[PDB]
Design a protein around this nucleic acid. Structure first.
Lengths: 126, 106, 100, 82, 153, 116, 97
RNA sequence: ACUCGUGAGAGACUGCCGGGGUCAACUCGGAGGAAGGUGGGGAUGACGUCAAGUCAUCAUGCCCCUUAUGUCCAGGGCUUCACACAUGCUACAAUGGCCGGUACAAAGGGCUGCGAUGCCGUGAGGUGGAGCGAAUCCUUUCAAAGCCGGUCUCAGUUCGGAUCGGGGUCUGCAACUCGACCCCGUGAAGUCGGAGUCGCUAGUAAUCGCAGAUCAGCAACGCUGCGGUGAAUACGUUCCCG
């Protein structure tokens, strides 16, 4: 079998792909019970859409860490990696789509003297 | 105009004198003043020739005007502070009469 | 801080170990169960007769050498001022400046 | 307030004072320093000289003021106005 | 922007209408990151407009935009140590942004008891040329006209 | 409807209409409505006279509301005042009585701000 | 099988300890699971630089504890005696359970 | 086997291509790559300035007290309030309140401490002690915003919670001055706030929750960290500040 991983800002998705039908098994829950948001479903299925290969792969996924948005992003990256593993020659179409690039946008570390990572305490000149 | 004076140590009568001397500068400011504060302190060391230290801060329509002086007693320090604040407010005016000689002409 | 107050803190600690160990703890065990007859026992009154210094509620974590009563750290028993100076000199094993 | 299991907290000093005071049914002025002591129905007739910080204020107990503490009736801070 | 212009974010097309403009609208009405609620509001407003008029949301939305899209504006420009209200030509992107912002803001002050109904009524009035955003465009064009004398710098 | 001398609102859910009684809030209204049995979601204009009577007798039986409660509260405050307790003179001069800070806040007991 | 738990303030020290521990237990002829790493435990403290005021200037310090786990099998008394007869650096502790 | 934990290593070096460039620094674009041009954030703060702050972390020259300005104790004070200034929190509501169901984190702490199942209370909480010096047990299996369903229908309201009355729990020898929390009732100002002014360029602002230090208990809405959802805008240096 083939297995890959996707990581998005503390969200980790381990993906297993088989040539079955377009059924999503996210930790035993479907694409409806899991991820109840249309935008997230688009974000998930975008690599399949640009690769034309929708509804010809059965996907199983193990999810841990992050929230729904980070999990969806990591799952999309993992799907893209699984697709490139299964079929190499469509790398341009995926790569020009940007789905093959990990996003290094993590939570910026909080700093001493500031309320937030960049927010500064209110200063009154008087 | 209302002034708050935060004195320190033993300065009897300095608060009233500073209040009445500084409150007369409201007409000098060309814009309304807000929350004008004064502070009086005395140097503990007798070796200082001018021990009394006076500080004043005014908020003239968002513009902060501050001054600081030293003196041998409360009265002299307050008077010098008043003169310094008057000079600062004169340099601050920004109204047309004070900004008409710098506008490009001809 | 003050030598007398550094000493008096220690005197409280030896008082605590002498009294709070069993005297000021059995009375609490008496008062805990409503079934236990506290009212006639005067375990409250008996424990009032004990010195105030028996109670740990009067203790104060001071710096172990400096005597500083505030900014204390329980891991080292040291003031924030002293921890900074000894960590910088490499005196506390496995302590260094942070980055992340 | 104090928990019901522990019972009301009355200092022993003025306690034995009031038992020796009420045993002959005479209520003389009793002077005390323990403001923290509550008021017991055994104090109904007795009058206490409760400490304030400068002096002692006389307080004559009644049935209404039982359950409170002595320090309620010895006001500490003196403020008259500006 | 002292060292040059900054790149633009390429926002994606919408799922249920496939147009850039509706995604821009949902981003404009977005508050506190509640993207799902903003999308619900916009989709409900579009469906309400469709039911009222009987035509496709996007065409009447575009008509409203073109009705409230400005072409001239007024900016404070300082020349020779003196400030004037100079009329300036508006780039198409800025005109679209201003039109959408005006639509959202004026729909937020309506009295139709719900965001969806207020937005639907505002977009319909703008399509018919009766919305308050149309009035704002008329006023800003009038102000640009009134200061035409300062157009030479 | 006239309930213990109080005119209920025109159209309200029953427990929240009963909240308008001075001695009844929401929890009291809910539990009494459950006890006597009339529906909580039913409006004020649907009350039958027998229903008015049953709420009347229940409230007068195991509740004290309106004038008696008001006068009992007033008498309690007055008695607390006259015994000279701390809360007494706190009530006398209109200052907070539960240890609230008075340096800046406590305009509720002080009333509207006055200038001098 | 007994667990040998290695805790250290020093990375290099913990690695050396694991390496010669496994070396002697495989010298004595016992099957080893290898130096399994465990999550490093971090203690963080924030202090103020100046003795007086200046709250906005802070220093951070941490203490890092590295953990190694050794699991062996067939506990022969020769291996047991070898284990009790090992000298170790003072940075590294040993917990045998 | 895939994560993950932690050891070693590789990987960004204008390395390559095209063009500007004194064929020089350097610069624009492109390919590759996870990352392209000090990748993101930290630690690191030159000579010195302001006689900046600290003789109350500590040390210290000089002066002063020494039957006291030292030292012990009880009570009180640091919490006082006609006002003024500053920093924050909660609100003024329908992008919401309440009720029911339901899904996802990271980090951290714990021995005379974390403390579960069970039982008793409406609820703080009480009894009890399983297991844990802890990738194991407990902090619940961890969250809230979120999603679904019902209700409220624009009102000083089912908003807001102050203030006040009564009744309790926990800690502590002791909750009066002067703790927190729980229950019932009470239901103020407040309709988005003048002159003026502050923060923020992307996982940022905004918003939601969690944890820790100090700590018997807490005034914590403070401070230090952790993650969830996550925008708008930048035409350009004329004006303001440095």
């Amino acid at each position: 079998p083939i297995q890959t991983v996707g990581r998005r800002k503390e969200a980790v998705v381990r993906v297993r792909l088989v040539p079955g039908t377009g059924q999503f098994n996210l930790d035993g829950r479907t694409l409806e019970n899991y991820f109840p948001n249309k935008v997230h479903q688009q974000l998930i299925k975008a690599p399949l859409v640009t690769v034309d290969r929708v509804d010809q792969f059965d996907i199983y996924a193990h999810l841990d860490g992050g929230g729904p948005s980070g999990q969806a992003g990591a799952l999309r990256l993992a799907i893209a990696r699984a697709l490139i593993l299964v079929q190499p020659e469509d790398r341009p179409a995926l790569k020009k789509a940007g789905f093959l690039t990990r996003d290094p946008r993590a939570i910026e570390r909080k700093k001493y003297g500031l309320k937030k990572a960049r927010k500064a305490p209110q200063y009154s000149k008087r | 105009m209302d002034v708050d004076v935060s004195t320190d140590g033993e300065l009897p009568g300095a608060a009233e004198y500073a209040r009445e001397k500084i409150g007369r500068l409201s007409r000098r400011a060309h814009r309304p003043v807000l929350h004008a504060r004064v502070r009086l302190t005395r140097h503990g060391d007798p070796a200082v020739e001018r021990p009394v230290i006076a500080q004043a801060n005014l908020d003239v329509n968002g513009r902060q005007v501050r001054a600081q002086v030293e003196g041998v007693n409360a009265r002299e320090a307050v008077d010098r502070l008043e003169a310094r604040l008057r000079s600062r407010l004169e340099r601050i005016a920004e109204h047309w009469e004070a900004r008409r000689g710098g506008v490009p002409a001809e | 801080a003050k030598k007398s107050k550094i000493v008096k803190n220690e005197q409280r600690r030896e008082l605590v170990q002498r009294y709070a160990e069993r005297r000021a703890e059995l009375k609490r065990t008496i008062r805990d169960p409503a079934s236990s007859p506290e009212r006639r026992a005067a375990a409250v009154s008996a424990l009032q007769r004990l010195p105030r210094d028996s109670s740990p509620v009067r203790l104060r974590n001071r710096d172990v050498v400096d005597g500083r009563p505030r900014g204390h750290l329980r891991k080292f028993g040291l003031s924030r001022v002293r921890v900074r100076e000894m960590a910088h000199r490499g005196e506390l094993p496995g302590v260094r400046k942070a980055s992340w | 307030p104090r928990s019901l299991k522990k019972g009301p907290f009355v200092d022993d000093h003025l306690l034995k004072k009031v038992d020796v005071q009420n045993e002959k049914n005479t209520k003389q002025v009793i002077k005390t320093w323990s403001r923290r002591s509550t008021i017991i129905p055994d104090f109904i007739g007795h009058t206490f000289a409760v400490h304030d910080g400068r002096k002692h204020v006389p307080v004559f107990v009644t049935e209404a003021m039982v359950g409170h503490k002595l320090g309620e009736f010895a006001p500490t801070r003196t403020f008259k106005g500006h | 922007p002292r060292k040059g212009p900054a790149p633009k974010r390429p926002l994606v097309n919408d799922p249920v209408y496939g147009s850039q403009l509706v995604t821009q609208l949902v981003n404009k009405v977005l508050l506190e990151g509640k993207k799902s609620l903003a999308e619900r509001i916009v989709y409900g407003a579009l469906e309400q407009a469709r039911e009222k008029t009987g035509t496709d949301p996007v065409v009447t939305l575009k008509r409203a935009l073109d009705n409230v899209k400005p072409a001239l504006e007024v900016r404070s420009r300082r020349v020779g140590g003196a400030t004037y209200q100079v009329p300036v030509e508006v780039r198409p992107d800025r005109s679209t942004t201003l039109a959408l912002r005006w639509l959202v803001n004026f729909s937020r002050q309506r009295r139709e008891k719900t965001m969806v109904e207020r937005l639907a009524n505002e977009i319909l009035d703008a399509s018919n040329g009766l919305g308050a955003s149309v009035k704002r465009r008329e006023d800003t064009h009038k102000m640009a006209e009134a200061n035409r004398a300062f157009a030479h710098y | 409807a006239r309930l213990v001398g109080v005119d209920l609102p025109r159209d309200k859910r029953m427990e929240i209409a009963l909240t308008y009684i001075y001695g009844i809030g929401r929890t009291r209204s809910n539990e009494i409505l459950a006890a006597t049995g009339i529906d909580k979601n039913m409006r004020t204009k649907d009350l039958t006279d027998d229903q008015v009577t049953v709420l009347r007798d229940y409230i007068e039986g195991n509740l004290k509301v309106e004038g008696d409660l008001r006068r009992e509260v007033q008498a309690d405050i007055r008695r607390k005042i006259e015994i000279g307790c701390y809360q007494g003179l706190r009530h006398r001069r209109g200052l907070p009585v539960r240890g609230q800070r008075t340096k800046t806040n406590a305009r509720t007991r002080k009333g509207p701000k006055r200038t001098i | 099988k007994i667990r040998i738990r290695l805790k250290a303030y020093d990375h290099e020290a913990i690695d050396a300890s694991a390496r010669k521990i496994v070396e002697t237990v495989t010298r004595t002829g016992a099957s080893v699971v290898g130096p399994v790493p465990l999550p490093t435990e971090k203690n963080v403290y924030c202090v103020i630089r100046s003795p007086h005021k200046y709250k906005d200037s802070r220093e951070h310090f941490e203490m890092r504890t590295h953990k190694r786990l050794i699991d062996i099998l067939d506990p022969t008394p020769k291996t047991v005696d070898a284990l009790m007869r090992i000298d170790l650096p003072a940075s590294v502790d040993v917990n045998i359970q």
